[PDB]
């Protein structure tokens, strides 16, 4: 009944407030709509008639988050891995440590941040004497071995 | 646009309660799109639990503090619930909503609505 | 929490008789009030936001109207599908329902 970024109120058609900004009161017929901006960790990425501003994400470094793109009063923080951490989905929502590599197996592809440590059986004749995420399957030197020992 | 909850329809003392609300008909992304949570006793009034924007921020009744958890999943199209450590007082008929304007409110639609009976 | 009282709570009318509800905030809540109505197992259903914009979809005997502290809603000629629990809610703070007003029909 009314018009693009705009609502009816009283048959009063009003101005909603636009991206960076909450409404504070809705217009009368003598008063436009009156919008305040979004604090410093708050956002509000729309024409709007919402009166609380939405919390930026927080990028938590105890799930493995750290700021990307900071925050704007229109957008939203974009968060990512730290280093030591990777994507537990295609869509980068939290992160897991990065996992290592037991003893007996070698390390075929270290982990990315949006990919974790890709793993490999030691074969017959090589060997991993302990669980890192870096180190590889080595050679048994000349002087038995194991999958694990020299 | 479409809105279903699913959850388990019993549920003990002090277990917690996860729901989750599936949206067909159209993409949570949008600018705008919020979700809600309200809930019922049987043959009782309306509470409000909570609302979710899909960015993650996130308001909900502080008659619930420390207990409830919201969260959207953008890419499943869902948004969820939890309420931990479970009474009889949270035995209802839990809905899921779209707040339209802002975090409160108004609602529309509606889900169908899941009873979640806490019950041993 | 701002409180929504609904009078009254129970009501029997008849067909073709007016019914208005009423719904009084415990503070100002501007023209940010919708009602809903619920029939029974179903979820509630809007008819009315922002006090007075009728929802697309809703029969026109369904009118609202009010502002700051009292609301009504109004069915201007009761049909029988119209057995329900009516509610308003408040959206100008973190939301509240009032307790439901039951309208039965006389027969």
């Known amino acids: 009944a009314c018009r693009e970024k705009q609502y009816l109120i009283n048959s009063q058609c009003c101005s909603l407030c636009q991206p960076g900004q909450k409404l504070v009161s809705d217009c009368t017929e003598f008063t436009e709509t009156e919008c305040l901006p979004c604090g410093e960790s708050e956002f509000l990425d729309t024409w709007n008639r919402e009166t609380h501003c939405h919390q930026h994400k927080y990028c938590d470094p105890n799930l493995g988050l750290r700021v990307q793109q900071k925050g704007t009063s229109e957008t939203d923080t974009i968060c990512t891995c730290e280093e030591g951490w990777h994507c537990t989905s295609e869509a980068c929502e939290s992160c897991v440590l990065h996992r290592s590599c037991s003893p007996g197996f070698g390390v075929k592809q270290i982990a990315t941040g949006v990919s974790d440590t890709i793993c490999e059986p030691c074969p017959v004749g090589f060997f991993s004497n302990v669980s890192s995420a870096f180190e590889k399957c080595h050679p048994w030197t000349s002087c038995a071995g194991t999958n694990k020992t020299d | 646009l479409q809105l279903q909850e699913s959850g388990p329809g019993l549920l003990k003392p002090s277990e917690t309660l996860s729901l989750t609300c599936t949206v067909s008909?159209?993409?949570?992304?949008?600018?705008?799109?919020?979700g809600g949570w309200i809930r019922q006793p049987p043959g009782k009034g309306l509470e409000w639990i909570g609302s979710?924007?899909?960015?993650?921020?996130?308001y909900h009744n502080p008659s619930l503090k420390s207990r409830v958890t919201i969260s959207v999943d953008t890419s499943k199209n869902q948004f969820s619930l939890k309420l931990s450590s479970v009474t009889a007082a949270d035995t209802a008929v839990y809905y899921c909503?779209?707040?339209?304007?802002?975090?409160?409110?108004?609602?529309?639609?509606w889900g169908q609505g899941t009873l979640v009976t806490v019950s041993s | 929490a701002i409180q929504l009282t609904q009078s009254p709570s129970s009501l029997s009318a008849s067909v073709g008789d007016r019914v208005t509800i009423t719904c009084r905030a415990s503070?100002?809540?501007?023209?940010?009030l919708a009602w809903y109505q619920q029939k029974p197992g179903k979820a509630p259903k809007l008819l009315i936001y922002?006090?007075?914009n009728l929802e697309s979809g809703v029969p026109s005997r369904f009118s609202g109207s009010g502002s700051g502290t009292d609301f009504t809603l109004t069915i201007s000629s009761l049909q029988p599908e119209d057995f329900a629990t009516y509610y308003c809610?408040?959206?100008?703070?973190?939301?509240?329902f009032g307790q439901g007003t039951k309208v039965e029909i006389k027969r």
């Open positions: 809610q408040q959206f100008n703070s973190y939301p509240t």
């Open positions: 503070q100002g809540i501007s023209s940010a």
């Open positions: 979710i924007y899909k960015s993650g921020s996130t």
């Open positions: 008909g159209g993409s949570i992304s949008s600018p705008g799109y919020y």
């Open positions: 922002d006090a007075s």
């Open positions: 909503t779209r707040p339209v304007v802002r975090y409160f409110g108004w609602f529309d639609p």
